[PDB]
Amino acid sequence: SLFNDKVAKLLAGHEALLMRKNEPVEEGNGVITRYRYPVLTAAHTPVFWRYDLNEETNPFLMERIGMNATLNAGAIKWDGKYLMLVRVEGADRKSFFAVAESPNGIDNFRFWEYPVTLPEDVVPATNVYDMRLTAHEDGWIYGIFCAERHDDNAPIGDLSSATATAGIARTKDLKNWERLPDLKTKSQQRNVVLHPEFVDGKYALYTRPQGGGIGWALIDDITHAEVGEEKIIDKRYYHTIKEVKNGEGPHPIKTPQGWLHLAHGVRNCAAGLRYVLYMYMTSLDDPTRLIASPAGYFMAPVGEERIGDVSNVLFSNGWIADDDGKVFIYYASSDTRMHVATSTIERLVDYCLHTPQDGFSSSASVEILKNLIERNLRLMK
Amino acid sequence: SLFNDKVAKLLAGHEALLMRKNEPVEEGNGVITRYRYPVLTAAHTPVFWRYDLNEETNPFLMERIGMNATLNAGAIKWDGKYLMLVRVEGADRKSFFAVAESPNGIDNFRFWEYPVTLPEDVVPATNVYDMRLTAHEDGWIYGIFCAERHDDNAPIGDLSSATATAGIARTKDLKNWERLPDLKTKSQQRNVVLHPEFVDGKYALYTRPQGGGIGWALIDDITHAEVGEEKIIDKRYYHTIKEVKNGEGPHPIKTPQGWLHLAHGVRNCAAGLRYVLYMYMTSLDDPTRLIASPAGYFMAPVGEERIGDVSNVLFSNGWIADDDGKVFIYYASSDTRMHVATSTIERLVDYCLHTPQDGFSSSASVEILKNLIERNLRLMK
Amino acid sequence: SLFNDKVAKLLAGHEALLMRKNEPVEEGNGVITRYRYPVLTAAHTPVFWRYDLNEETNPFLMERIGMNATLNAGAIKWDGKYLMLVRVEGADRKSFFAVAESPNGIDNFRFWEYPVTLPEDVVPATNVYDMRLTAHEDGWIYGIFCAERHDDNAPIGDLSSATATAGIARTKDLKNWERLPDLKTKSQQRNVVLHPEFVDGKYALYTRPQGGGIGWALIDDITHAEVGEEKIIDKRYYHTIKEVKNGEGPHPIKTPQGWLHLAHGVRNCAAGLRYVLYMYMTSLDDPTRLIASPAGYFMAPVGEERIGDVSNVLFSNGWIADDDGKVFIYYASSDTRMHVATSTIERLVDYCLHTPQDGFSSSASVEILKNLIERNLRLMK
Amino acid sequence: SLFNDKVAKLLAGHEALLMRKNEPVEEGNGVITRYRYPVLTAAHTPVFWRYDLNEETNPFLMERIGMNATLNAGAIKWDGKYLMLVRVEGADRKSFFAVAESPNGIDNFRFWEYPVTLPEDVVPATNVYDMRLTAHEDGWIYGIFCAERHDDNAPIGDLSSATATAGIARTKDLKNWERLPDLKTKSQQRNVVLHPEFVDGKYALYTRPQGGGIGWALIDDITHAEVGEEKIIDKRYYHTIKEVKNGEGPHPIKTPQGWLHLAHGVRNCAAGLRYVLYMYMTSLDDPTRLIASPAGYFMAPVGEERIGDVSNVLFSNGWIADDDGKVFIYYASSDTRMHVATSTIERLVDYCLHTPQDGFSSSASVEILKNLIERNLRLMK
Amino acid sequence: SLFNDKVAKLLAGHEALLMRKNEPVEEGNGVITRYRYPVLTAAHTPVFWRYDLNEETNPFLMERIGMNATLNAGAIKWDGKYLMLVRVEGADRKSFFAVAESPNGIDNFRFWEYPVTLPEDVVPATNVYDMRLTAHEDGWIYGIFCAERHDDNAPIGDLSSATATAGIARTKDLKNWERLPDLKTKSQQRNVVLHPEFVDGKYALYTRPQGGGIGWALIDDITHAEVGEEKIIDKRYYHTIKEVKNGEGPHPIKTPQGWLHLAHGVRNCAAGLRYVLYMYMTSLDDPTRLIASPAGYFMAPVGEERIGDVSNVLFSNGWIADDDGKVFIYYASSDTRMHVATSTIERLVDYCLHTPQDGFSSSASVEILKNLIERNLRLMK
């Protein structure tokens, strides 16, 4: 029948998209390798999420639930597979979480048939987004996320003012989730991330109070989490890529040289807010102590990445490092699609350690550059 | 001569562009079909609008009047032809109206040789734009549009503050237009649209006071139009595609199931304001009563649509429904170019009736999705 | 070795990019001709600016200093060569100046091996940008630029508020620069440009106080420059391409018909600020007196130009006119890359003189258009 | 499992290829419409024809039986479907027959899971090819094909000299085939085709003895087929597209205006033999009598059709005419792949009836052309 | 200097071409992997082979010696590099030999600055071509090639009749070559190839007398080479890919399973002669005894390979097998350009051993196919 042929074609076209082999982009900077195709787009959501496949109830075979974007995803290496904890935004402008898994980490990501069911905390949330997964040494996988609500105290007709808390859930299977109480805090918090080890026998959170920058907060009890003392670890600075805002991405990776961090930085321009990624390192002995601050951005929007629902944005709240040192960086572009970039622990550490630090002025930048040119011209002689 | 050959080539290249056959995009959602090419761009304006073709007065053969964009167009089925009432914006940043006609509704749109001459109302307007055409049962074609003026009461050096009224003109031929008095109103009005039938023996306007949403106002005399009582029909809602603003597009289409509406909704993001299209239905018995509110957006910017003078925008103030049920939706992208999308009355009604309503939260969205997945997995067994 | 082969390939790929022949875009308006490729991108900076080429110190061969953009460039015809004074922005978000030279003016631009070393004035600057070069009749080449500093008087956590002065440097070789004192002024100044001739035996600056528009200021002593009397030459106007801001681009070109100017104009839209280029002419007898104001924009973003770090922007602070009348216009798109467009003095003068002036309303625009259509239809008879 | 993922990708890529929607080629001559994609290629053969899918016996997952080409196909409308009787050539250079079916006639052709099993005649054949299907009024489907054997008369070392008979098989289901005795004949026969009606109560064959052209032979008993008298119906002519050889393609279509034929014509050139398609018509009253001989070729190799294993060839032995007059022409290009072209009975009859006949010389061709030009120029005034 | 810039651009474009990274073709049959780009083309010859770079003697900078094709190349692993012994054909239609080397075997092949100087034998040759290199156990590298001369027996006016001998040269450095006497033989020989081991204490040649197929001849003294007894190892067969001619390609690779051979097979068609590659294996114990004859062709012209000076041809006289079993197959397409395809010894042996043998008829091919289908469908259940 015409209907059944149409359903067959949707399924076949979908499988072809899902199985497409990704290819590295040859042109790169030696630090990261980009890939030709996104790892996930709205079109990667299953056909049976969007269409009602029953001819009786959907004779025109049209989509009943539109999917708009797949973005800002957490990530975890899980039972030999590479998993994203995807933020999926529907046509209805709400986001929900959904696991997608790949055997190799650069392609063939497929969504689990059901997305994530996340119980509400005592106060219901309107939107939830941007989950960072942490396999904590206490044996749980934590998901720390943003739970946003309308600010019910706003001028009449203001339907845009919102508040947001750090949501905390934990799971041992990524299917059955327990919702712990939202983080208690004096300042608004976003980009809250769980450090994977106890510090002074306490849970440690990366925070972003709103604000000096990315903060560090020790938490006695994750099941009754409340920020007391808060210490800024990485600061915003005038005329850097992290002038207006910054925030931790995924939880850092432990290396013999220190904690390796991936964050985002914001500045304002004539087109709005511009988001790029940057890296920094902190000490193993004292994770609150910066030991590497390479200048500038680590990644910024290139090509297709520049354009989407919220253009001029790269964002990451997920990456995976394999035992062999290979690193898979999962980053959204323009709040619309997910990409992968690959590097190694050794390369990322070298990049952090030997990219000159920002001296904070045109003159300082020129002098660092002139020094490198001078060394190179001597060599090329 | 070299000059005459150059003129010949401009004309021939122009005819080739105008006559290009459009092709549907195969990949779609079953609700609407997009097309490969815009129906109108600035390059579609006639050569004799832009160049002085006289070698005596333009020996270099350069354009004397630049055309920048063709956008937010009204539409009407007219004497067997498919017509857009185009908003054409010159290089000078002023807009004017111009009729363009096509024999088939998806391509070969050509501008009438002269654009629209629209008399001023008592108070002259600086810019006029976004006309909605209504073949009213009183036998006139009305054009309701935005007439914008500088707010002559602004801080010194403020050359941006403006006010805008609903302009009302009517015609029986689309060439000779009578300008009626601007709509009198307490609130600023934009996106004002004439309903094509008398209601309680009065003219009925869709309004957008600035604001709760899209309003309904009965008008005793269209030749002395003044808003008295105003009733909101479709509301803005927090964390939907219509959070910050919304507005009626073209006048709705009457179906046996009710009035079928096309509107735009706005939200703010890091890149500015984001405009998408959405649909809703109201009752035949009481056009002020909503009977269908499918969740989310109906159309959002895809691909080339995402980019233009005002990126991240879809807008529509025109569509045509033929007697056979075929619907032609004329929509601008990014304030730069006009596109067509096609559907049918039956499909648009089904989309409005069976796309689940927005339950207004991530949890609600997940539950609707999980229900559809469950039905589908059972079927696919 | 693998390393040496990798270095060889970087160098060879770089030379191939640098030597690529540009091609004109056939489709144009008869005023300017665009070209297929940018004249400069971040990828045009030398390999030895970005990589440490020593295997001992960079065994992974990764970039040590990222280059982000090449934009808003000055320009000068210099010893038979076509030179841009490029604003180069590093990954660190600081800009510095660098000379790039081409034998033909449309391609094969190559950076001088070292960028520009510019001494600080008494008060150090954080960022310097957008230099306009003027070969003044006093025998110096002046560079007038923007020197930006953080406004150290801002609310706590405000790391974005800044001030900016007009920096003044001069040189006779473009390598050794003398820094004169920053321009003293009551209003903030940007887009300050040196007129190439003494006027009433004084230095003359184009200014942009922040503001009525582009101003004119006579300066007794360029080595102790201070604005006293200031006169607006070209005004901002409501609902034009220069509504919110405007500013002089490069210094004007002298023609027998008057001074030929290139400027930028800004308006606000839903996507942010939109920058286009426009032209005007002033009198030889009195350079403060406008004699030509063609309506609208001269150039606006087309295609690839629309997208970049700061989208929806064209900017120019440099052009070259050869003795034969050929004009090379160097313009940035989207704060990301440099382009060239070509015309002639005769064509640019004709464009300024015979593009109708803006009558400032939709009605006025329609009437000018209807007049041209009428002339053309008569001719085409 | 890497292997299982690999098999899954093979099947998925194959289904995507099979299901691809064909699209009409816009540019045409008003007689036939070509399509963007072939209807069949070697890649269309089932994955399970080529690969051993068992990891135990094929751990490297390589092809065990290469498929080289899908060409010269018969065709039949069968149980509401559009069927090709494909000549499939393996890498081993032998051809075999296989049914492929499509729901619509222009795409989604899929091979039946098993190819055709054809019993040998008394003398076994080395290669069998080019089957023409005829649903005869006697209630059988006949396939008349070429059965080729090495020539025993050949000298030692001559492994190329071959002979061919017309094979005759019949079936009621296209799965179980009865092989009747090879056509007995004094001359070598190829391109033998069964007319679908008895004529004078006898079976009628189109023949091609080798040679005046396409012949007509009445046969008393198809189960003991032997040509006696043969009449030439369509002749070869010096300096036409059918100079060296010609041959009937599929059996002709009956129209109210006569029998509509499709054939191939051959000429020799510097690159070898060049094959094109041509048409002619014969009388209903006397199918041996020509009633239309449009000049020249009907179709010749265009674009991708020009190249293959045997370049510069179009060949057809299959077409389908639906009740509504729509015609689907299945033609191979360059002995490599199968294409479809569409027309209607009315258009094909008009083409045959009103394309001027070949007057056989440059001067005659010029006179026909000048007469048409004269008519058109008079019209265009 | 315009000239010097032009020379610099020639060298830069050439280095870019030479250094281009090759990429594997994704779609393959599991036996061999093709690559996106040729390894060599006429354009790969050094700029200084073609242009006179002296402005005094070549002021227009045009080519003084055109290069037409790079084809039928021998190959050898040499001092850790991958070398082709290229047949380079000039515009003058003579071929000569030239070494080209690559660090990796799939790209970055570069010609040695001088081509091969090969001393004539007693009777000078007009053209020399198609060299097979054999690193023989006697410690020499032999090149056995074709040496062609005009046939003196030809009639006046016949300038095409030619004769060919097997040329024999040897070297220890691929620069200084010793020419041994041409192979003495009763029949014309071509595709003569030296086996790399003594057999019964004698040199062993693969021969192709003209003709039963590929022959085997033991030679006492390679410095006075004369064929006595010849045994045919691989035969031509009617209606296979090796019907008209066949010939050994490069010398075979020794594997634990036997000698692995690569050869070419020829058949005639309407477009001329069609050349494909095929494989066979012979016994280690007795290299004259066939132990594997996979049916059909191993590789045939695909895509761009189909077209060139002599279309419809693949040809190979060179391949390299590394210690790790990786195999690089160097094959010309259409006598015009050189390609690489990769496999492994294990895969090639499996291909030869488990591709069913040719049963020599359509019915046999069908039976082999139906057996595989049956196995797969049972599996797929």
UniProtKB/Swiss-Prot annotation, chains A, B, C, D, E:
pH dependence: Optimum pH is 7.
Record-linked InterPro entries: Glyco_hydro_beta-prop_sf, Man_Glc_phosphorylase, Mannoside_phosphorylase
Catalytic activity: 4-O-beta-D-mannopyranosyl-D-glucopyranose + phosphate = alpha-D-mannose 1-phosphate + D-glucose
Keyword Cell wall biogenesis/degradation belongs to the record: yes
Biological processes per GO annotation: carbohydrate metabolic process; cell wall organization
Entry note: thermal dependence: Optimum temperature is 50 degrees Celsius.
Assigned EC number: 2.4.1.281
Record key words, sorted: Carbohydrate metabolism, Cell wall biogenesis/degradation, Glycosyltransferase, Transferase
Pfam family, one: Glyco_hydro_130
GO MF assignments: hexosyltransferase activity
Enzyme class: transferase
Described function: Converts 4-O-beta-D-mannopyranosyl-D-glucopyranose (Man-Glc) to mannose 1-phosphate (Man1P) and glucose. Involved in a mannan catabolic pathway which feeds into glycolysis.
Family, as annotated: Belongs to the glycosyl hydrolase 130 family.
Classification via HAMAP family: Man_Glc_phosphorylase
Protein name (database record): 4-O-beta-D-mannosyl-D-glucose phosphorylase
Biological source species: Bacteroides fragilis (strain ATCC 25285 / DSM 2151 / CCUG 4856 / JCM 11019 / LMG 10263 / NCTC 9343 / Onslow / VPI 2553 / EN-2)
Lineage of the organism: Bacteria, Pseudomonadati, Bacteroidota, Bacteroidia, Bacteroidales
